């Protein structure tokens, strides 16, 4: 008798298509840029991942393979993760807020042709939607490495939010 | 021909159903085989259970035993955990732990009387003490970064019963006595070092002998088998000085 | 865990001799690296020492040139260093380490904090 | 006590040797487990044989015999093939195969007198006819790209042996009687597509 | 192997109407979107129809407004269109399909040649 | 008894040091950069990969 | 199981000599022949 994995493994920071009813999760091994989605067609959203206590700064990115720039700062202790939204080709780049902790985790999933991602400040983090159009057929690349975890499961999966990567005890 | 037959090989005899109560001492360790991967050096395709032979002896009534046995397992489960996908990352195909589900067998054989009798059986009996079998630690050579350790492990022995398998081949018997143990978990919890699973109920294959020569286990023994011994009877008139 | 033993110390005449030792047990200390350091008030620690994956490949610090020198016992898992006849300011503690980059996935942590004790 | 001690609990009785020789036909069918991997649907964690049962009956000079048996391996061959590494792969940790080196075990039993005299034993020979067992074809339902498919396999049963196994629990003796056949592969080979 | 089969041939009076069905055996065909194109002499095929895992939208292309419907059925794995009165530049064989774009890695062919015969 | 097999694995395109005695083998899958060695000290070198028939540019 | 015969006695006691002849190999040896009687002893022979 066999018994499953206690996670599903950290895979490679990869470009695909993940289906629905499926929290990705993430976690960084770099500054700056974590992950992107998009359909490129209405719908352009990236986030950066920031350490705590950085200034206000122009920074440069290699977003969307033509290096872009734009502002990130912080203040709290924690790490911050400012995501980037765009909505049409030309539109100025939204930079839209956030998502905060200390975990160094982010999560996101598609249900319903709507967009569910975490967002706020661990313990006290929770889930916010988008919606768009056409948006099973979005994509999603990543450039850290990454879970996956099927939906039944929002009990646990905000609690790894709250506090992921079960202890690592030496 | 393609129908039923019977014939009789002999005519009748005498058999007595005598009642030997002995009293036992067997004694076991564990085997376990590693088996690496081809690559850097940090998936681990196999650390399983394996037959493990050994033999001693001890006393018992004065008449020295000289005792034999294999010890093997069944029903075990077979975790996997893969640390990373990368070939610098750290992987264990399948590793063997034993649980409630799992039972655990040692063949045992011995060259004393009670013991060599037990060709043609009734019932056989027995009643042992229950021991803890524990797991000791295991440094998984990493040729990079800080080296996984495998730790803790306990779980009880209880008795579940006894087989007698008898292997034929032309006439001639090859037969094999196996103790068939239970198991029952224990504290502390068995956990593989800087890894995601930690406090996790077994006792993992890695080193079960922890250090040990051997798990003991003491016990009574009874038998009722069919001797051939006659009565004194079917004996020539002048039988005696 | 992961342990570094080290032997040698004491009162040392100046322009005498002695041997010091720094084994190591809970790694490979085979694809690792090695250095040597010296430790002191203010002026700071400073590079003594180099060998990684013994090329026929070293190199020394300033002040250590020919007075000191090296062996990295991969039979015993450890460096062994042959001391003489250098200046007061020697008085220190010495100290063996290695610091490894290589991209570890995540799901364990295959990090050091690699410093005996000296 | 730590001391030797005998009794006798039944004077002699008289016992006749006997040989018993029917023709038997054993039928068995196979069990295979497949199970998922937590995740997308792409790594199949187990597919490995599992112990089958199956129960009939025939005849046999017009006595019907009701049989009973159950089928399992033992030193099966593991074959651990990793297409790809990524969420998006195909894969299967685990799949069971056998081999020369394997041994393929099916117990069996019957309730006629012929079989119910089998509890104390001096002898047994048998001879089987050599049959050969082929593979059907799974299609793995992968939510993505081309369907694997796994095809072909083909072994041969020779007669290895038979046991005679009675576990013990309190004056009651459960028995079972275990052919042990041997393989030797043939064509066609098998193959995942 | 990987079986697409249709049916629903035959001659159409223009001002009329039929069935056309594309069923689907070796894939999963949820995961998948499906269209149609009508093939011909040297005008050249084009894109009829749209479905990609049921949004409640769809996409329907310039001489196929209306007097075409189409269906996607998951349980029956297929694709069936209602066709109905339309200009006589239907005469042409039309073809189900999809072309499949995601990475797969190496070892193994995920790869079709995604075409019915039509 | 467990069998080896055939291939290591198709692992990913990642950052690392090799150690020896060990033949790395690479299969392209786009144009362009198939991969980059280094010491970073005296040693730079990597490989481009072209399909066949490319003018000269 | 390696049978085991063991045991059994007798003690030849003697009763009367007489003339008898050896026919030996080389030539016909002029002899005496005692007739030992016989007698059960304890050991009881077995097949064990």
């Known amino acids: 008798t066999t018994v499953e994995p206690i996670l599903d493994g950290p895979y490679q920071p990869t470009t695909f298509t993940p289906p629905n009813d499926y929290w990705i999760l993430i976690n960084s091994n770099t500054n700056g840029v974590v992950y992107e989605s998009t359909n490129n067609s209405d719908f352009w959203t990236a986030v950066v991942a920031i350490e705590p206590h950085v200034t206000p700064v122009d920074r440069q990115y290699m977003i969307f393979g033509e290096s872009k720039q734009f502002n990130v700062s912080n203040d709290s202790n924690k790490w911050k993760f400012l995501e980037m939204f765009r909505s049409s080709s030309q539109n100025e780049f939204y930079n839209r807020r956030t998502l905060t902790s200390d975990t160094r985790l982010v999560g996101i999933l598609k249900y319903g042709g709507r967009v569910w991602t975490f967002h706020g400040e661990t313990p006290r983090a929770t889930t916010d939607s988008s919606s768009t159009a056409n948006l099973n057929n979005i994509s999603i690349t990543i450039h850290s490495e990454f879970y996956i975890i099927p939906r039944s499961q929002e009990s646990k999966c905000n609690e790894y939010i709250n506090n992921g990567l079960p202890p690592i005890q030496n | 021909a393609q129908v039923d037959e019977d014939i009789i090989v002999s005519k009748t005899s005498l058999w007595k159903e005598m009642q030997y109560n002995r009293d036992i001492i067997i004694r076991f360790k564990f085997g376990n085989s590693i088996v690496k991967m081809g690559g850097l050096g940090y998936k681990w395709s196999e650390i399983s259970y394996k037959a493990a032979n050994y033999q001693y002896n001890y006393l018992r009534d004065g008449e020295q035993v000289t005792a034999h046995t294999t010890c093997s397992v069944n029903g075990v489960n077979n975790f996997s955990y893969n640390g990373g996908f990368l070939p610098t990352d750290f992987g264990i195909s399948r590793y063997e732990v034993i649980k409630e589900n799992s039972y655990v067998y040692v063949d045992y054989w011995d060259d004393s009387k009670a013991f060599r009798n037990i060709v043609y059986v009734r019932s056989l009996a027995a009643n042992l003490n229950s021991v803890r079998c524990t797991g000791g630690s295991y440094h998984f050579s990493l040729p990079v970064g800080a080296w996984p350790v495998i730790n803790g492990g306990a779980v009880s022995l209880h008795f579940a019963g006894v087989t007698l398998s008898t292997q034929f081949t032309d006439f001639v018997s090859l037969n094999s006595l196996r103790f068939r143990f239970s198991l029952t978990v224990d504290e502390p919890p068995f956990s593989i070092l800087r890894t995601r699973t930690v406090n996790l109920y077994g006792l993992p294959a890695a080193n079960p002998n922890n250090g040990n020569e051997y798990y003991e286990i003491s016990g009574r023994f009874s038998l009722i088998s069919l001797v051939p011994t006659n009565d004194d009877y079917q004996t020539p008139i002048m039988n005696s000085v | 865990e992961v342990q570094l033993v080290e032997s040698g110390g004491g009162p040392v005449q100046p322009g005498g001799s002695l041997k010091l030792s720094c084994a190591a047990s809970?790694?490979?200390?085979?694809?690792?690296?090695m250095y040597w350091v010296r430790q002191a008030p203010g002026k700071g620690l400073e590079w003594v020492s180099y060998?990684?994956?013994?090329?026929?490949?070293?190199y020394y610090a300033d002040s250590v040139r020919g007075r000191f020198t090296i062996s990295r016992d991969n039979a015993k898992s450890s460096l062994y260093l042959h001391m003489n006849s250098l200046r007061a300011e020697d008085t220190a503690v010495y100290y063996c380490?290695?610091?490894?980059?290589?991209?570890?996935?995540?799901?364990?942590?295959?990090?050091?904090?690699?410093w005996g004790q000296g | 006590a730590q001391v030797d001690e005998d009794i006798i609990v039944s004077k002699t009785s008289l016992w006749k040797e006997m040989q018993y020789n029917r023709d038997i036909i054993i039928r068995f069918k196979f069990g295979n487990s497949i199970v998922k991997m937590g995740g997308l649907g792409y790594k199949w964690s187990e597919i490995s044989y599992k112990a089958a049962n199956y129960q009939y009956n025939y005849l046999r000079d017009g006595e019907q015999v009701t049989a009973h048996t159950t089928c399992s391996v033992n030193g099966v061959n593991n074959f651990s093939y990793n297409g790809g590494f990524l969420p998006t792969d195909f894969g299967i940790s685990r799949y069971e195969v056998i081999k020369e080196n394997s041994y393929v075990y099916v117990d069996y039993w019957d309730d006629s007198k012929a079989f119910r005299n089998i509890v104390y034993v001096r002898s047994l020979a048998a001879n089987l006819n050599s049959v050969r067992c082929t593979g059907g074809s799974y299609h793995f339902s992968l939510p993505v790209g081309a369907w694997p498919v796994i095809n072909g396999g083909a072994v041969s049963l020779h007669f290895a042996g038979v046991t005679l196994s009675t576990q013990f629990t309190d004056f009651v003796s459960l028995n079972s009687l275990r052919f042990r056949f041997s393989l030797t592969v043939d064509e066609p080979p098998f193959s995942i597509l | 192997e990987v079986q697409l089969v249709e049916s629903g041939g035959g001659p159409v009076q223009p001002g009329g109407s039929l069935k056309l069905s594309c069923?689907?055996?070796?894939?999963?065909?949820?995961?998948?979107?499906?269209?149609?194109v009508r093939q011909a002499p040297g005008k050249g095929l084009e894109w009829?129809?749209?479905?990609?895992?049921?949004?409640?939208?769809?996409?329907?292309?310039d001489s196929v407004r209306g007097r075409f419907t189409i269906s996607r059925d998951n349980a029956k794995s297929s694709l069936y269109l209602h066709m109905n009165s339309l200009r006589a530049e239907d005469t042409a064989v039309?073809?189900?399909?999809?072309?499949?774009?995601?990475?797969?890695?190496?070892?193994?062919?995920?790869?079709?040649?995604?075409?019915?015969?039509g | 008894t467990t069998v080896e097999p055939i291939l290591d694995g198709p692992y990913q395109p990642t950052t690392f040091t090799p150690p020896n005695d060990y033949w790395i083998l690479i299969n392209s899958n786009t144009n362009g950069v198939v991969y980059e060695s280094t010491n970073n000290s005296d040693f730079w070198t990597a490989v481009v990969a072209i399909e066949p028939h490319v003018t000269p540019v | 199981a390696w049978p085991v015969i063991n045991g059994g006695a007798v003690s030849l006691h003697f009763a009367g000599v007489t003339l008898s002849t050896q026919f030996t190999d080389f030539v016909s040896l002029n002899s005496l022949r005692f007739r030992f009687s016989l007698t059960v002893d304890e050991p009881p022979f077995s097949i064990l």
């Open positions: 380490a290695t610091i490894s980059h290589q991209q570890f996935s995540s799901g364990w942590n295959a990090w050091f904090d690699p």
């Open positions: 060998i990684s994956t013994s090329p026929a490949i070293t």
């Open positions: 809970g790694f490979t200390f085979s694809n690792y690296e």
